[PDB]
Amino acid sequence: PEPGQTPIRGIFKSIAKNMDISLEIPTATSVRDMPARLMFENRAMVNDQLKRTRGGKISFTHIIGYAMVKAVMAHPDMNNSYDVIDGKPTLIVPEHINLGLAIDLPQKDGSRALVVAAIKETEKMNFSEFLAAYEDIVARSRKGKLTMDDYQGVTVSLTNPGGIGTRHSVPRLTKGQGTIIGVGSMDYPAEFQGASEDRLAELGVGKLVTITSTYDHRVIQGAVSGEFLRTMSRLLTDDSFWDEIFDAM
Amino acid sequence: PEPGQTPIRGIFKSIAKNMDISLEIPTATSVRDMPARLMFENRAMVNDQLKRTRGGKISFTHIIGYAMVKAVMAHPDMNNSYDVIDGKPTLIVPEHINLGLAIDLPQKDGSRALVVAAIKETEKMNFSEFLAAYEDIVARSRKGKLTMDDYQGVTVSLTNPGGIGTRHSVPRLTKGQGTIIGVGSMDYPAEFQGASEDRLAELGVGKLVTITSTYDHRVIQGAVSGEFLRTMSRLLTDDSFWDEIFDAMNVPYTPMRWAQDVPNTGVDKNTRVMQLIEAYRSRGHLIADTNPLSWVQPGMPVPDHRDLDIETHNLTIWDLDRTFNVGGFGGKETMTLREVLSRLRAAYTLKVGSEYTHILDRDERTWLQDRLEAGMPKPTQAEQKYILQKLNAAEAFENFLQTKYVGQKRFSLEGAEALIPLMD
Ligand SMILES: CC(C)(COP(=O)(O)OP(=O)(O)OC[C@H]1O[C@@H](n2cnc3c(N)ncnc32)[C@H](O)[C@@H]1OP(=O)(O)O)[C@@H](O)C(=O)NCCC(=O)NCCSC(=O)CCC(=O)O
Ligand SMILES: CC(C)(COP(=O)(O)OP(=O)(O)OC[C@H]1O[C@@H](n2cnc3c(N)ncnc32)[C@H](O)[C@@H]1OP(=O)(O)O)[C@@H](O)C(=O)NCCC(=O)NCCSC(=O)CCC(=O)O
């Protein structure tokens, strides 16, 4: 690359500014690893049904995203944020659960940028509605028909560095939000990446997913964040949770 | 310890100040666990070559350090830093990749301090150059002859808390840098630390290393950091990466190849092992270190010697520690594949290459086989000195004629002086 000093401008300047503002948020992180076997099996069944129907195709982020929404409803404290109004610390309780998706956008110029588009009012959706709303945001982001309203009102964020193969991450929390959830790689642990399928199948080793919760510690306690991740882990292996998805699809 | 309040001064004061400055950097961390089996195997081979050469000894930090440099070249964004020039946010793109090593220095006073010494211009080095530059910095740091220039110009840092046994860490990023890479413990997971080697070998559990990337989020995106770690993971198990290192360190054997364990189905592995033994006894000479020159004649057809690779016999690295019946090979009924390979290589691929399996008489073949596999007996010092005298006489005679009769044909033996001790 060509050395030298180039001023930061455009979307990148706004990103840099927001990261500087985020320094004023005291954050803590909870990390939990969850079995992913049942997620692999049941997603395959759903995709098989969609194939015969000639519909679409769900991803792991759809399932985890929906499970996350359910877990926030079970633990509403995770949706709260902090602010200083009139010079007093205030606990903001949002009216809806607006799920922010971290969407990586490799631009045609060459550089890549990350944006957080909101899926609004997720607390009043089923899986079918959630999937439609999810795909709408993603579809528009690629073609680049996102309005300013799409970027506003985010109450909780979801990021998926696990696609690249990152085991887990400790992301930054943006101002005006309570927590951000990171989804790690859904793969065998590194110590099993050389083992044969026969030996793994014999022993009964399953794939895992690591989920992180980075939250504002001024308004969210560590126990609440822990219980939130526990709920998510339970949902992903719950009969009722998967029955709901199967009925919807 | 003695209670009280003591002002911080010296190097410790500068460290404390720098850590306070680092609070203004919004950092995020990516964590990735990588298989370390191939790193253990191939490092052993390199160190074995250095032992015979009587050279040095490479470490895991050398390999990971070099792989990290390669990964930064593949992802240059990781080398960029942030600064405010004239009151405007600026993206600084450095001209070189200066790798900072976190060196722990237990001082003679009693206290220990950490310093970050720079290896400069790593983007224009091979492994040999990198290793030399690495060792130079480390050597000088211990004796304490580091100049001020060594501490300046760091663009990216590498820290290794894994030596102590820390699984992974979330370190702090210093101002003027884009990212810092942390290397965790290269060991079995805690859940396997009580398991027997037999059960681990049977299942095919490998050691892992956890690498972290802590980066300035203002200039480096999470996707870039993720892809950086992915590249590092690929390099550490890449054939090309290890071929480059082997060539630099002059290792004659083919590196062990990353491959999945194979089931003991069809042809038994005991069969395969004894086929490997016959392969080496028959064709081991094809890869023997018999040529004094590193020379291959262009236009001479290179024979195929795939029969000497364990892959050809449907064996893998995961079979190395498994025991097989070798039917009296090496005067033992049972042996590990590792030991079988060691004995075969020692007998057939070192300085003596033998062709005897073509001999039809079994007593002849056995006589030769027993002596070749027993190996050369260690000569006495008197015998060694006698060999030197003969070598000296051979060379000195040739050199004397060259001096006294420069323009006279003699057909010198120079380059083949070992003929004289051979005939003797
Ligand atoms: C909009 C989304 C979220 C949509 O993604 P989706 O998962 O729905 O689809 P996709 O990525 O196209 O999926 C492609 C394939 O990857 C698989 N896949 C997806 N997530 C996975 C995971 N965690 N583990 C394993 N496999 C995964 C899918 O099943 C699919 O497999 P099949 O082909 O079999 O279907 C996309 O843009 C995305 O993935 N963005 C990544 C977010 C990102 O870049 N974040 C920056 C990190 S910022 C951060 O965390 C800071 C800290 C740090 O990490 O450093
Ligand atoms: C200059 C270096 C880096 C050179 O180290 P090298 O690895 O080249 O050699 P060495 O340490 O002498 O190696 C001794 C033995 O340990 C092994 N070894 C080295 N690193 C290893 C690892 N990650 N896992 C397992 N084994 C390891 C070597 O193979 C070798 O085994 P053999 O004998 O079989 O060859 C040295 O000073 C060092 O190791 N420093 C430690 C770095 C440090 O203190 N960082 C501060 C953490 S600050 C930080 O991270 C903040 C966050 C936090 O951790 O809390």
Short mmCIF file of N, CA and C in Angstrom, two decimals, chain A residues 17-95:
data_model
loop_
_atom_site.label_atom_id
_atom_site.label_comp_id
_atom_site.label_asym_id
_atom_site.label_seq_id
_atom_site.Cartn_x
_atom_site.Cartn_y
_atom_site.Cartn_z
N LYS A 17 -16.00 8.76 14.59
CA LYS A 17 -16.54 9.67 15.60
C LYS A 17 -17.37 8.90 16.62
N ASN A 18 -18.19 7.96 16.14
CA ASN A 18 -19.07 7.18 16.99
C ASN A 18 -18.26 6.30 17.94
N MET A 19 -17.12 5.78 17.46
CA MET A 19 -16.26 4.93 18.26
C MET A 19 -15.60 5.74 19.38
N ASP A 20 -15.30 7.02 19.10
CA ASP A 20 -14.75 7.91 20.10
C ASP A 20 -15.79 8.20 21.18
N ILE A 21 -17.06 8.33 20.78
CA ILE A 21 -18.14 8.60 21.72
C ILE A 21 -18.37 7.38 22.61
N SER A 22 -18.14 6.18 22.06
CA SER A 22 -18.42 4.94 22.77
C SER A 22 -17.46 4.72 23.94
N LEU A 23 -16.38 5.51 24.01
CA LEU A 23 -15.41 5.40 25.09
C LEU A 23 -16.04 5.75 26.44
N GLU A 24 -17.18 6.45 26.44
CA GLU A 24 -17.79 6.92 27.68
C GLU A 24 -18.75 5.87 28.24
N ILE A 25 -18.82 4.69 27.61
CA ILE A 25 -19.69 3.62 28.08
C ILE A 25 -18.85 2.56 28.78
N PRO A 26 -19.01 2.36 30.11
CA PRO A 26 -18.35 1.26 30.81
C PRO A 26 -19.05 -0.07 30.53
N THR A 27 -18.40 -0.92 29.73
CA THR A 27 -19.01 -2.15 29.26
C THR A 27 -18.35 -3.35 29.93
N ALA A 28 -19.15 -4.40 30.14
CA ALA A 28 -18.66 -5.71 30.53
C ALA A 28 -19.19 -6.74 29.54
N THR A 29 -18.54 -7.90 29.48
CA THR A 29 -18.88 -8.93 28.51
C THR A 29 -19.11 -10.26 29.23
N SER A 30 -20.19 -10.95 28.84
CA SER A 30 -20.44 -12.33 29.23
C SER A 30 -20.24 -13.22 28.00
N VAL A 31 -19.61 -14.38 28.20
CA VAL A 31 -19.34 -15.31 27.11
C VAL A 31 -19.95 -16.65 27.48
N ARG A 32 -20.72 -17.24 26.56
CA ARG A 32 -21.30 -18.55 26.78
C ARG A 32 -21.23 -19.38 25.50
N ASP A 33 -20.79 -20.63 25.64
CA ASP A 33 -20.75 -21.57 24.53
C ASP A 33 -21.97 -22.48 24.62
N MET A 34 -22.62 -22.72 23.48
CA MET A 34 -23.88 -23.45 23.43
C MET A 34 -23.76 -24.58 22.41
N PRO A 35 -24.40 -25.75 22.64
CA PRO A 35 -24.46 -26.81 21.62
C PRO A 35 -25.20 -26.32 20.38
N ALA A 36 -24.70 -26.69 19.20
CA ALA A 36 -25.27 -26.22 17.95
C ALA A 36 -25.79 -27.38 17.09
N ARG A 37 -25.73 -28.62 17.60
CA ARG A 37 -26.09 -29.79 16.81
C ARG A 37 -27.54 -29.68 16.34
N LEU A 38 -28.44 -29.37 17.28
CA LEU A 38 -29.87 -29.38 16.99
C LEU A 38 -30.20 -28.26 16.01
N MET A 39 -29.42 -27.17 16.05
CA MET A 39 -29.62 -26.04 15.15
C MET A 39 -29.27 -26.46 13.72
N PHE A 40 -28.21 -27.27 13.57
CA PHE A 40 -27.81 -27.77 12.27
C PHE A 40 -28.87 -28.71 11.70
N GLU A 41 -29.40 -29.61 12.54
CA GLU A 41 -30.31 -30.64 12.09
C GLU A 41 -31.66 -30.03 11.68
N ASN A 42 -32.20 -29.15 12.53
CA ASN A 42 -33.53 -28.62 12.34
C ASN A 42 -33.55 -27.58 11.23
N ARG A 43 -32.44 -26.85 11.05
CA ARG A 43 -32.34 -25.88 9.96
C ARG A 43 -32.35 -26.62 8.62
N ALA A 44 -31.70 -27.79 8.58
CA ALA A 44 -31.64 -28.59 7.37
C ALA A 44 -33.05 -29.04 6.97
N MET A 45 -33.86 -29.41 7.96
CA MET A 45 -35.22 -29.87 7.72
C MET A 45 -36.07 -28.74 7.15
N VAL A 46 -35.91 -27.53 7.71
CA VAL A 46 -36.66 -26.37 7.27
C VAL A 46 -36.26 -26.02 5.83
N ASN A 47 -34.96 -26.06 5.53
CA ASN A 47 -34.46 -25.73 4.21
C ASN A 47 -34.90 -26.78 3.19
N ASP A 48 -35.05 -28.03 3.64
CA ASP A 48 -35.55 -29.10 2.78
C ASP A 48 -37.00 -28.82 2.38
N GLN A 49 -37.80 -28.33 3.34
CA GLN A 49 -39.19 -28.01 3.07
C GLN A 49 -39.28 -26.82 2.12
N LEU A 50 -38.40 -25.83 2.30
CA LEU A 50 -38.39 -24.65 1.44
C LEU A 50 -37.95 -25.01 0.03
N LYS A 51 -37.08 -26.02 -0.09
CA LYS A 51 -36.58 -26.46 -1.39
C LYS A 51 -37.72 -27.07 -2.21
N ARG A 52 -38.52 -27.95 -1.59
CA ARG A 52 -39.64 -28.58 -2.27
C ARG A 52 -40.70 -27.52 -2.62
N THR A 53 -40.87 -26.54 -1.73
CA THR A 53 -41.81 -25.45 -1.93
C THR A 53 -41.26 -24.46 -2.95
N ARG A 54 -39.94 -24.49 -3.17
CA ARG A 54 -39.25 -23.58 -4.07
C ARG A 54 -39.33 -22.16 -3.50
N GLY A 55 -39.17 -22.06 -2.17
CA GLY A 55 -39.18 -20.78 -1.48
C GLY A 55 -37.77 -20.20 -1.37
N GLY A 56 -37.41 -19.77 -0.15
CA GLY A 56 -36.10 -19.20 0.11
C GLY A 56 -35.20 -20.18 0.86
N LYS A 57 -34.40 -19.65 1.79
CA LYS A 57 -33.48 -20.43 2.58
C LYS A 57 -33.11 -19.64 3.83
N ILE A 58 -33.38 -20.22 5.01
CA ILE A 58 -33.06 -19.56 6.27
C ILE A 58 -31.59 -19.81 6.60
N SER A 59 -31.03 -18.92 7.42
CA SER A 59 -29.65 -18.99 7.86
C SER A 59 -29.62 -19.13 9.38
N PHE A 60 -28.41 -19.31 9.93
CA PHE A 60 -28.24 -19.44 11.37
C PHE A 60 -28.54 -18.12 12.06
N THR A 61 -28.28 -17.00 11.38
CA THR A 61 -28.50 -15.68 11.96
C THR A 61 -30.00 -15.42 12.13
N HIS A 62 -30.83 -15.97 11.23
CA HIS A 62 -32.27 -15.85 11.35
C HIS A 62 -32.75 -16.54 12.63
N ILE A 63 -32.24 -17.75 12.88
CA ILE A 63 -32.67 -18.55 14.02
C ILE A 63 -32.16 -17.91 15.31
N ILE A 64 -30.87 -17.56 15.33
CA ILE A 64 -30.25 -16.97 16.51
C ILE A 64 -30.85 -15.59 16.75
N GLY A 65 -31.06 -14.83 15.66
CA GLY A 65 -31.69 -13.53 15.74
C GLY A 65 -33.07 -13.59 16.38
N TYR A 66 -33.87 -14.59 15.98
CA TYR A 66 -35.22 -14.74 16.50
C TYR A 66 -35.18 -15.20 17.95
N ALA A 67 -34.29 -16.15 18.26
CA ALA A 67 -34.11 -16.63 19.62
C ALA A 67 -33.68 -15.49 20.53
N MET A 68 -32.85 -14.58 20.00
CA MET A 68 -32.36 -13.44 20.75
C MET A 68 -33.52 -12.51 21.10
N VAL A 69 -34.44 -12.30 20.14
CA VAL A 69 -35.60 -11.45 20.36
C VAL A 69 -36.46 -12.04 21.48
N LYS A 70 -36.66 -13.36 21.45
CA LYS A 70 -37.44 -14.05 22.47
C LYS A 70 -36.79 -13.89 23.84
N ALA A 71 -35.45 -13.94 23.88
CA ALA A 71 -34.71 -13.87 25.13
C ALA A 71 -34.76 -12.46 25.72
N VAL A 72 -34.79 -11.44 24.85
CA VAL A 72 -34.90 -10.05 25.30
C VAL A 72 -36.28 -9.83 25.92
N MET A 73 -37.31 -10.48 25.37
CA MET A 73 -38.66 -10.37 25.89
C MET A 73 -38.73 -11.01 27.28
N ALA A 74 -37.99 -12.11 27.47
CA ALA A 74 -37.94 -12.81 28.75
C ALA A 74 -37.13 -12.02 29.77
N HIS A 75 -36.17 -11.21 29.29
CA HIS A 75 -35.32 -10.40 30.14
C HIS A 75 -35.32 -8.97 29.62
N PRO A 76 -36.38 -8.17 29.89
CA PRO A 76 -36.52 -6.84 29.30
C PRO A 76 -35.43 -5.83 29.69
N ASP A 77 -34.71 -6.10 30.79
CA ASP A 77 -33.65 -5.22 31.26
C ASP A 77 -32.55 -5.07 30.21
N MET A 78 -32.37 -6.09 29.36
CA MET A 78 -31.32 -6.09 28.36
C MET A 78 -31.61 -5.06 27.27
N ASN A 79 -32.86 -4.57 27.19
CA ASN A 79 -33.26 -3.64 26.15
C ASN A 79 -33.10 -2.19 26.62
N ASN A 80 -32.86 -1.98 27.92
CA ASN A 80 -32.78 -0.64 28.49
C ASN A 80 -31.44 0.00 28.14
N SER A 81 -31.40 1.33 28.13
CA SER A 81 -30.19 2.08 27.85
C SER A 81 -30.00 3.19 28.89
N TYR A 82 -28.85 3.87 28.82
CA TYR A 82 -28.50 4.91 29.76
C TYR A 82 -28.40 6.25 29.02
N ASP A 83 -28.75 7.33 29.72
CA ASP A 83 -28.60 8.67 29.18
C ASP A 83 -28.62 9.68 30.33
N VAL A 84 -28.05 10.87 30.07
CA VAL A 84 -28.06 11.96 31.03
C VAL A 84 -29.01 13.03 30.53
N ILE A 85 -30.21 13.09 31.13
CA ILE A 85 -31.23 14.07 30.76
C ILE A 85 -31.27 15.15 31.84
N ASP A 86 -31.10 16.40 31.41
CA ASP A 86 -31.16 17.59 32.26
C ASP A 86 -30.09 17.53 33.36
N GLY A 87 -29.04 16.73 33.13
CA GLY A 87 -27.94 16.62 34.07
C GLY A 87 -28.20 15.59 35.17
N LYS A 88 -29.13 14.66 34.93
CA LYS A 88 -29.40 13.57 35.86
C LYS A 88 -29.31 12.23 35.13
N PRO A 89 -28.67 11.20 35.73
CA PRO A 89 -28.69 9.85 35.17
C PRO A 89 -30.11 9.29 35.06
N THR A 90 -30.47 8.84 33.85
CA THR A 90 -31.81 8.35 33.58
C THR A 90 -31.74 6.97 32.93
N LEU A 91 -32.65 6.08 33.34
CA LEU A 91 -32.81 4.78 32.72
C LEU A 91 -33.89 4.87 31.64
N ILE A 92 -33.48 4.72 30.38
CA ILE A 92 -34.39 4.77 29.25
C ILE A 92 -34.93 3.36 29.00
N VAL A 93 -36.27 3.24 29.01
CA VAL A 93 -36.95 1.99 28.68
C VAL A 93 -37.62 2.18 27.32
N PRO A 94 -37.08 1.59 26.22
CA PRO A 94 -37.68 1.73 24.90
C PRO A 94 -39.06 1.08 24.81
N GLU A 95 -39.84 1.53 23.83
CA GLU A 95 -41.23 1.11 23.67
C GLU A 95 -41.30 -0.16 22.83
#
